[PDB]
Design an enzyme around this catalytic site. Structure first.
Site, PDB file in Angstrom:
ATOM      1  N   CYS A 132       0.745  -1.292   0.000  1.00  0.00           N
ATOM      2  CA  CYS A 132       0.000   0.000   0.000  1.00  0.00           C
ATOM      3  C   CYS A 132       0.778   1.349   0.000  1.00  0.00           C
ATOM      4  CB  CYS A 132      -0.866   0.073   1.253  1.00  0.00           C
ATOM      5  SG  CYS A 132      -1.727  -1.529   1.617  1.00  0.00           S
TER       6      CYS A 132
ATOM      7  N   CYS B  91       1.424   3.992  -3.268  1.00  0.00           N
ATOM      8  CA  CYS B  91       0.312   4.840  -3.721  1.00  0.00           C
ATOM      9  C   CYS B  91      -0.279   5.728  -2.607  1.00  0.00           C
ATOM     10  CB  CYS B  91      -0.848   3.995  -4.258  1.00  0.00           C
ATOM     11  SG  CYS B  91      -0.449   3.083  -5.824  1.00  0.00           S
ATOM     12  N   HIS B  92      -0.446   5.176  -1.414  1.00  0.00           N
ATOM     13  CA  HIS B  92      -1.082   5.939  -0.313  1.00  0.00           C
ATOM     14  C   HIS B  92      -0.099   6.774   0.535  1.00  0.00           C
ATOM     15  CE1 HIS B  92      -5.172   4.530  -0.840  1.00  0.00           C
ATOM     16  NE2 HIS B  92      -4.614   3.429  -1.275  1.00  0.00           N
TER      17      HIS B  92
ATOM     18  N   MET C 211      -7.570   1.885  -7.548  1.00  0.00           N
ATOM     19  CA  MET C 211      -7.491   1.080  -6.331  1.00  0.00           C
ATOM     20  C   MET C 211      -7.666  -0.410  -6.624  1.00  0.00           C
ATOM     21  SD  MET C 211      -7.198   0.524  -3.068  1.00  0.00           S
ATOM     22  CE  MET C 211      -7.483  -1.065  -2.404  1.00  0.00           C
TER      23      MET C 211
ATOM     24  N   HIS D 283       7.026  14.379 -11.617  1.00  0.00           N
ATOM     25  CA  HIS D 283       7.748  13.121 -11.568  1.00  0.00           C
ATOM     26  C   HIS D 283       9.034  13.177 -12.385  1.00  0.00           C
ATOM     27  CE1 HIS D 283       7.990   8.949 -10.472  1.00  0.00           C
ATOM     28  NE2 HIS D 283       8.015   8.532 -11.728  1.00  0.00           N
TER      29      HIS D 283
ATOM     30  N   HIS E  16       4.102   9.908 -18.946  1.00  0.00           N
ATOM     31  CA  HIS E  16       5.339   9.304 -18.424  1.00  0.00           C
ATOM     32  C   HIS E  16       6.433   9.367 -19.493  1.00  0.00           C
ATOM     33  CE1 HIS E  16       8.065   6.465 -16.505  1.00  0.00           C
ATOM     34  NE2 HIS E  16       7.356   6.651 -15.420  1.00  0.00           N
TER      35      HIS E  16
HETATM   36  C1  DHE Z   1      11.450   9.780  -9.659  1.00  0.00           C
HETATM   37  C2  DHE Z   1      11.669   8.712 -10.685  1.00  0.00           C
HETATM   38  C3  DHE Z   1      12.441   8.764 -11.809  1.00  0.00           C
HETATM   39  C4  DHE Z   1      13.230   9.938 -12.306  1.00  0.00           C
HETATM   40  C5  DHE Z   1      14.561  10.088 -11.739  1.00  0.00           C
HETATM   41  C6  DHE Z   1      15.423  11.040 -12.442  1.00  0.00           C
HETATM   42  O1  DHE Z   1      15.414  11.026 -13.695  1.00  0.00           O
HETATM   43  O2  DHE Z   1      16.135  11.845 -11.779  1.00  0.00           O
HETATM   44  C7  DHE Z   1      12.332   7.506 -12.473  1.00  0.00           C
HETATM   45  C8  DHE Z   1      13.031   7.049 -13.588  1.00  0.00           C
HETATM   46  C9  DHE Z   1      13.200   5.750 -14.051  1.00  0.00           C
HETATM   47  C10 DHE Z   1      14.102   5.279 -15.049  1.00  0.00           C
HETATM   48  C11 DHE Z   1      14.906   6.152 -15.937  1.00  0.00           C
HETATM   49  C12 DHE Z   1      14.980   6.099 -17.213  1.00  0.00           C
HETATM   50  C13 DHE Z   1      15.449   7.164 -18.095  1.00  0.00           C
HETATM   51  O3  DHE Z   1      15.618   6.910 -19.304  1.00  0.00           O
HETATM   52  O4  DHE Z   1      15.659   8.291 -17.613  1.00  0.00           O
HETATM   53  C14 DHE Z   1      14.071   3.893 -15.014  1.00  0.00           C
HETATM   54  C15 DHE Z   1      14.901   2.916 -15.777  1.00  0.00           C
HETATM   55  C16 DHE Z   1      13.051   3.518 -14.089  1.00  0.00           C
HETATM   56  C17 DHE Z   1      12.644   2.225 -13.739  1.00  0.00           C
HETATM   57  C18 DHE Z   1      11.492   1.859 -13.082  1.00  0.00           C
HETATM   58  N1  DHE Z   1      10.740   2.709 -12.344  1.00  0.00           N
HETATM   59 FE1  DHE Z   1      11.043   4.730 -12.114  1.00  0.00          FE
HETATM   60  N2  DHE Z   1       9.608   4.772 -10.648  1.00  0.00           N
HETATM   61  C19 DHE Z   1       9.517   5.757  -9.729  1.00  0.00           C
HETATM   62  C20 DHE Z   1      10.284   6.887  -9.645  1.00  0.00           C
HETATM   63  C21 DHE Z   1      11.065   7.425 -10.650  1.00  0.00           C
HETATM   64  N3  DHE Z   1      11.380   6.766 -11.814  1.00  0.00           N
HETATM   65  C22 DHE Z   1       8.441   5.454  -8.789  1.00  0.00           C
HETATM   66  O5  DHE Z   1       8.211   6.035  -7.757  1.00  0.00           O
HETATM   67  C23 DHE Z   1       7.679   4.273  -9.358  1.00  0.00           C
HETATM   68  C24 DHE Z   1       6.312   4.863  -9.958  1.00  0.00           C
HETATM   69  C25 DHE Z   1       7.387   3.226  -8.343  1.00  0.00           C
HETATM   70  C26 DHE Z   1       8.527   2.374  -7.933  1.00  0.00           C
HETATM   71  O6  DHE Z   1       8.299   1.231  -7.480  1.00  0.00           O
HETATM   72  O7  DHE Z   1       9.683   2.816  -8.040  1.00  0.00           O
HETATM   73  C27 DHE Z   1       8.617   3.882 -10.512  1.00  0.00           C
HETATM   74  C28 DHE Z   1       8.522   2.767 -11.337  1.00  0.00           C
HETATM   75  C29 DHE Z   1       9.553   2.140 -12.008  1.00  0.00           C
HETATM   76  C30 DHE Z   1       9.556   0.724 -12.408  1.00  0.00           C
HETATM   77  O8  DHE Z   1       8.688  -0.079 -12.219  1.00  0.00           O
HETATM   78  C31 DHE Z   1      10.891   0.456 -13.091  1.00  0.00           C
HETATM   79  C32 DHE Z   1      10.556   0.027 -14.608  1.00  0.00           C
HETATM   80  C33 DHE Z   1      11.696  -0.603 -12.428  1.00  0.00           C
HETATM   81  C34 DHE Z   1      12.054  -0.365 -11.010  1.00  0.00           C
HETATM   82  O9  DHE Z   1      13.187  -0.752 -10.610  1.00  0.00           O
HETATM   83  O10 DHE Z   1      11.230   0.202 -10.254  1.00  0.00           O
HETATM   84  N4  DHE Z   1      12.490   4.672 -13.588  1.00  0.00           N
HETATM   85  C1  HEC Z   2      -1.994   2.217  -6.358  1.00  0.00           C
HETATM   86  C2  HEC Z   2      -1.355   1.403  -7.469  1.00  0.00           C
HETATM   87  C3  HEC Z   2      -2.811   1.654  -5.197  1.00  0.00           C
HETATM   88  C4  HEC Z   2      -2.455   0.697  -4.349  1.00  0.00           C
HETATM   89  C5  HEC Z   2      -1.195  -0.132  -4.504  1.00  0.00           C
HETATM   90  C6  HEC Z   2      -3.390   0.700  -3.236  1.00  0.00           C
HETATM   91  N1  HEC Z   2      -4.355   1.677  -3.376  1.00  0.00           N
HETATM   92 FE1  HEC Z   2      -5.870   2.170  -2.163  1.00  0.00          FE
HETATM   93  N2  HEC Z   2      -6.480   3.513  -3.465  1.00  0.00           N
HETATM   94  C7  HEC Z   2      -5.824   3.957  -4.610  1.00  0.00           C
HETATM   95  C8  HEC Z   2      -6.609   5.036  -5.264  1.00  0.00           C
HETATM   96  C9  HEC Z   2      -6.227   5.850  -6.477  1.00  0.00           C
HETATM   97  C10 HEC Z   2      -7.762   5.177  -4.558  1.00  0.00           C
HETATM   98  C11 HEC Z   2      -9.012   5.969  -4.977  1.00  0.00           C
HETATM   99  C12 HEC Z   2      -9.868   5.226  -6.009  1.00  0.00           C
HETATM  100  C13 HEC Z   2     -11.264   5.840  -6.227  1.00  0.00           C
HETATM  101  O1  HEC Z   2     -12.107   5.190  -6.884  1.00  0.00           O
HETATM  102  O2  HEC Z   2     -11.533   6.961  -5.742  1.00  0.00           O
HETATM  103  C14 HEC Z   2      -7.640   4.264  -3.419  1.00  0.00           C
HETATM  104  C15 HEC Z   2      -8.514   4.229  -2.367  1.00  0.00           C
HETATM  105  C16 HEC Z   2      -8.344   3.482  -1.199  1.00  0.00           C
HETATM  106  C17 HEC Z   2      -9.259   3.491  -0.088  1.00  0.00           C
HETATM  107  C18 HEC Z   2     -10.586   4.219  -0.025  1.00  0.00           C
HETATM  108  C19 HEC Z   2     -10.411   5.622   0.489  1.00  0.00           C
HETATM  109  C20 HEC Z   2     -11.718   6.245   0.893  1.00  0.00           C
HETATM  110  O3  HEC Z   2     -12.623   6.350   0.042  1.00  0.00           O
HETATM  111  O4  HEC Z   2     -11.846   6.621   2.070  1.00  0.00           O
HETATM  112  C21 HEC Z   2      -8.810   2.622   0.829  1.00  0.00           C
HETATM  113  C22 HEC Z   2      -9.540   2.198   2.087  1.00  0.00           C
HETATM  114  C23 HEC Z   2      -7.590   2.085   0.275  1.00  0.00           C
HETATM  115  N3  HEC Z   2      -7.326   2.610  -0.967  1.00  0.00           N
HETATM  116  C24 HEC Z   2      -6.806   1.129   0.905  1.00  0.00           C
HETATM  117  C25 HEC Z   2      -5.680   0.540   0.377  1.00  0.00           C
HETATM  118  C26 HEC Z   2      -4.902  -0.453   1.060  1.00  0.00           C
HETATM  119  C27 HEC Z   2      -5.048  -0.863   2.538  1.00  0.00           C
HETATM  120  C28 HEC Z   2      -4.002  -0.896   0.139  1.00  0.00           C
HETATM  121  C29 HEC Z   2      -2.910  -1.943   0.310  1.00  0.00           C
HETATM  122  C30 HEC Z   2      -3.232  -3.342   0.811  1.00  0.00           C
HETATM  123  C31 HEC Z   2      -4.177  -0.089  -1.053  1.00  0.00           C
HETATM  124  N4  HEC Z   2      -5.218   0.788  -0.904  1.00  0.00           N
HETATM  125  C32 HEC Z   2      -3.325  -0.121  -2.144  1.00  0.00           C
HETATM  126  C33 HEC Z   2      -4.663   3.404  -5.114  1.00  0.00           C
HETATM  127  C34 HEC Z   2      -3.993   2.296  -4.586  1.00  0.00           C
END
Ligand code: DHE
Ligand code: HEC
Ligand code: DHE
Ligand code: HEC
EC number: 1.7.2.1
Lengths: 539, 539
Positions: free
Chosen positions: A43, A46-47, A84, A323, A365
């Site tokens: 969780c 995202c949260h 969600m 981002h 993205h």
């Molecule tokens: C903030 C950020 C950057 C930019 C940094 C910069 O350029 O200074 C970035 C870049 C990247 C870049 C840069 C590529 C480029 O060409 O600049 C790569 C390879 C990459 C691989 C991944 N990222 Fe990334 N990434 C995040 C964060 C970021 N990603 C997340 O928070 C997210 C959504 C969730 C996570 O679990 O990290 C996410 C998912 C992913 C993936 O799932 C990837 C494919 C594999 C992994 O290890 O998480 N992100």
């Molecule tokens: C992102 C990839 C998500 C993950 C991982 C989890 N949640 Fe989530 N959650 C997400 C969104 C964008 C939203 C809103 C969706 C909508 O239709 O409005 C939510 C919402 C919840 C809520 C409801 C909030 C409320 O209405 O009060 C709960 C209770 C919640 N999410 C719980 C939750 C938990 C416990 C998770 C991990 C086991 C979880 N979420 C993961 C996006 C994402």
């Protein structure tokens, strides 16, 4: 006793407005720790760590207690169509666990540890002192055409020789390294794991080895080097997810110098946010500054390192959920996507201001983007989306094409949503886009290629995964990346750690399979960063 | 669902390092609020709203549960000789309450409300629009020689006529106004209560009236107006104790424009501090900026308002616990005191840097200070202390007196500690020092007056309180303030709300009693601010 009466007047704070927390379902030490164990694994991304809401709604006691137990369990179970996940329907979490989660989100969020200078210095190490490092390149490697590939789940990176296609060295780093960045001189490789552990690698030593390391937080994503003329290898900066902060270190030894908190007021509602995660960071070529992206508050900060002792920072409001992003062709405007806002902020690094906010598609993205000269619209910068299969082309030339500057001038159409990176190169006449997280297997295992000499025609599909001949597994392809010459495009076939993966090279001139890199040490390959192109921002 | 798998990986945060707070002694709702009330009434002043500690050790669960019930009760009961009052020994609290506090402080600190734009705009009122205000002075008062006196407990301020010594107009304001500042045009009077409510008063109306008001936080201490050339009445800024922040508003209407959090890393340890209260604020005459003091982190911020849309701040590090301070004779160096560090920081507002950190006595409390030309040492700025009876004189002329620049050039001796303000005037040859919080009644009810034409000679004691002829009550005398022409010095005989108070005026040339201001409306008078001297920093 004087000091006693001096501060012996009442606090202007009204106790009735200071709220005690509680009235949640009683849950033991283990019921709580199990719920806490699940929360960060499934969780927190995202949260958010504090549950004030990032991509998803706030899950703090005030709101969760109002919803109550049953609403919470049902919601967590079936999910919603707006992002969600359905934890119960999909059978990802048992009803028993979902019950504990509903109870967990009703308590005060547990507090994660802070991480300042004491912890940073304790984690800091200089493996090879500057004076003990080579004065010349002690090897025959073509450093410019090297690739720094991430072996995600192995907590390592791989240096792959672009022309030979062989692994030259596997180095131990932080877990699941997110990106690779080159120093301005092209000598040092900078990798940073998601755990905030940064490793500095000397590409000149007999064999590329680590010369320094540090941990700048509990979680992180970005690292960068100072690139302004006269500041080569001077400073290195890194942004952390938790705590909300960024650190500036010596670019030679990674010695921590300054630590700055990013906790602040949002740009939209202008209220206080407790968790503004730092995202992309790009070094400015116009002034001695780093351009930092603060996500949840939607602020682009220009951190000036001219005087690292008295830090001057310029806070520019952009748009919420900043981002990733990259430079336009001229390296003056910072094209960055505020993905959950469906906009692309343009930051003028010369005039140090917000040039515009362009409406694009669902969850842009761009990565670092794709720059090329459109035959009609002039110089553009493009990005693909995660929420849809559209590709936005934006005008980036105010001088010769003012009527198109900062406008969604045209749109292209890929295979579908779930796209993560769009690529191109000066020498190249092709435009590649992956679809890594597209829910379809055939689509997620292939990339789309467009003809820039005829953008009216549809894209051709390159079956990257099939070409790799790997067998079972999801085999998600990701991030196209060219070589220094610009005649080879590389792709990673990201398979499970217990499955087999590969790096697939394509002849950009003919679109034909050129090579396939397999190796028992190539575990879950993700980011590949060619030295030259990463060093000089060639995209 | 692409966005779902896209954020499916786990947080780098270790579940085991996120901790649940509790194991505190059980206490019912009634018991918890009784203690919570006492805490903000008696303890938050020194220990802070979140209890991370200010002038006192942190009172957070990790520490207090380690000490246990017995240690806590015994300490709250007798106190310590280092500033911690003996709540039990003095009979101020009962063994029952003390037991309740020792329990309260073992629980998670309750959470106070935030206060952003929604809340500020909601409280923001424009009483008289700029269009409906006068165009010229509609009254015949000698505004420059007026006095803005704080009727503390009464939640008001009185405008006293310097020459007539009478109360011209009593105005309703925030509770316990802390200070009064004049706008650059000498037209508007700005006042701020400890509850963070600001009131703008137009001195041109037939009868001085409030033209706008706003609440910038839960609790605050300072307000300032832009004084850089060309920015008269352009911006108003205020600092807040809680939340840790400052707000910048429109200087004509008080419309909130920007809010900036001051939560951040500390100057000394460089660790995160969740409650760095904003102390003194002074407008820069060198650049279009405000020099803000952030107490717990010991940071002096230079907020540039040339462009308040994209705020630029320069964070200069000084020393822990910045509080009050003021301009040197030339209005270029901000002489501020880091009172719990026993130092004085000198912030150069032209070059924008920390000039030096000067060691002084115990707990320097300069107020805005006292500037004069020493016969031997040259231009100096002085301050008295709260912890000892010394008066430190610091050199302020690095251009024509480099030998004494930023050095505690000499000391003087007053009646004793508990001093709060020192004063002088360019046209005067006397230097006054009060002893408001000195534990001995006689001393606290008088002021010391040195001769600047003969500093070797001991001071003379003036029976200010005794001269008032008021009767019973503590009669603490406070803050020597001069008039427009600098020939009389005013003092405040700050007596209880139910007792009788007055303002005693002295003939500076003869050190003789000149007048005494009494009025049934003059309730608990504290700070007095002569319009001219405040507006033109004459001190
Ligand atoms: C903030 C950020 C950057 C930019 C940094 C910069 O350029 O200074 C970035 C870049 C990247 C870049 C840069 C590529 C480029 O060409 O600049 C790569 C390879 C990459 C691989 C991944 N990222 Fe990334 N990434 C995040 C964060 C970021 N990603 C997340 O928070 C997210 C959504 C969730 C996570 O679990 O990290 C996410 C998912 C992913 C993936 O799932 C990837 C494919 C594999 C992994 O290890 O998480 N992100
Ligand atoms: C992102 C990839 C998500 C993950 C991982 C989890 N949640 Fe989530 N959650 C997400 C969104 C964008 C939203 C809103 C969706 C909508 O239709 O409005 C939510 C919402 C919840 C809520 C409801 C909030 C409320 O209405 O009060 C709960 C209770 C919640 N999410 C719980 C939750 C938990 C416990 C998770 C991990 C086991 C979880 N979420 C993961 C996006 C994402
Ligand atoms: C931050 C701060 C300033 C500087 C403002 C500026 O220049 O912008 C200031 C100034 C001041 C000034 C300004 C004088 C000047 O000439 O500049 C006055 C009159 C004043 C009356 C008092 N102050 Fe003050 N004062 C505090 C805070 C401050 N005091 C406290 O936190 C403290 C220690 C405890 C409290 O209860 O507020 C404290 C005690 C006092 C008092 O006890 C006084 C005498 C009465 C009262 O109302 O609290 N303080
Ligand atoms: C300033 C005028 C104070 C007020 C009002 C209160 N406290 Fe305090 N406290 C203060 C100081 C400067 C110190 C340091 C003592 C030393 O010798 O260094 C303390 C300390 C405490 C402690 C001890 C903390 C510890 O050592 O673990 C406790 C338990 C404590 N103070 C409690 C407390 C309570 C409950 C008060 C209000 C009812 C209170 N303090 C007021 C300064 C000041």
């Amino acid at each position: 006793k004087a000091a006693e009466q001096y501060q012996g007047a009442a606090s202007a704070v009204d106790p009735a407005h200071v709220v005690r927390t509680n009235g949640a379902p009683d849950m033991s030490e283990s019921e709580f720790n199990e719920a806490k164990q699940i929360y960060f694994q499934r969780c927190a991304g995202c949260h958010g760590v504090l549950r004030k809401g990032a991509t998803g709604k706030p899950l703090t006691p005030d709101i969760t207690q109002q919803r109550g137990q049953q609403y919470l369990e049902a919601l967590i179970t079936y999910g919603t169509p707006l992002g969600m996940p359905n934890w119960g329907s999909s059978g990802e979490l048992s009803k028993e666990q979902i019950t504990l989660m509903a109870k967990y989100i009703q308590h005060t969020p547990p507090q994660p540890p802070e991480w300042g200078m004491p912890e940073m210095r304790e984690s800091w190490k200089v493996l090879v002192k500057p004076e003990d490092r080579p004065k010349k390149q002690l090897n025959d490697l073509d450093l410019p055409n090297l690739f720094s590939v991430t072996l995600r789940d192995a907590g390592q990176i791989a240096l792959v020789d672009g022309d030979s296609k062989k692994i030259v060295k596997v180095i131990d780093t932080g877990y699941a390294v997110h990106i690779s960045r080159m120093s301005a001189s092209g000598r040092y490789l900078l990798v940073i794991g998601r755990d905030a552990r940064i490793d500095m690698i000397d590409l000149w030593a007999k064999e590329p080895t680590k010369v320094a390391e540090i941990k700048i937080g509990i979680e992180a994503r970005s690292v960068e080097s100072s690139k302004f003329k006269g500041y080569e290898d001077r400073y290195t900066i890194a942004g952390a997810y938790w705590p909300p902060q960024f650190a500036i270190m010596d670019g030679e030894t990674l010695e921590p110098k300054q630590i700055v908190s990013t906790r602040g007021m949002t740009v939209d509602t202008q209220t206080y946010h407790p968790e503004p995660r730092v995202a992309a960071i790009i070094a400015s070529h116009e002034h001695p500054e780093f351009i930092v992206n603060v996500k949840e508050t939607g602020k682009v900060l220009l951190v000036n390192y001219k005087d690292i002792d008295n830090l001057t920072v310029t806070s520019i409001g952009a748009a919420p959920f900043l981002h990733d992003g990259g430079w336009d062709s001229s390296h003056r405007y910072f094209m960055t996507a505020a993905n959950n806002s469906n906009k692309v902020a343009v930051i003028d690094s010369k005039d140090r201001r917000l040039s515009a906010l362009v409406d694009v598609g669902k969850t842009p993205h761009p990565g670092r983007g794709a720059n090329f000269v459109h035959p009609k619209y002039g110089p553009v910068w493009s990005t693909s989306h995660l929420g849809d299969g559209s590709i936005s082309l934006i005008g980036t030339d105010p001088k010769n094409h003012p009527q198109y500057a900062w406008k969604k001038v045209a749109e292209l159409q890929g295979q579908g949503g779930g796209s993560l990176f769009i690529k191109t190169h000066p020498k190249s006449s092709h435009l590649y886009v992956d679809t890594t997280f597209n829910p379809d297997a055939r689509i997620s295992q292939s990339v789309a290629v467009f003809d820039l000499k005829n953008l009216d025609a549809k894209y051709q599909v390159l079956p990257i995964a099939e070409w790799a001949d790997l067998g079972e597994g999801a085999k998600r392809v990701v991030q196209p990346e060219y070589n220094k010459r610009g005649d080879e495009v590389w792709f990673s076939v990201w398979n499970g750690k217990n499955d087999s993966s590969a790096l697939v090279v394509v002849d950009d001139k003919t679109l034909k399979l050129k090579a396939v890199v397999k190796d028992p040490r190539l575990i879950t390959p993700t980011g590949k960063f060619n030295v030259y192109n990463t060093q000089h921002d060639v995209y």
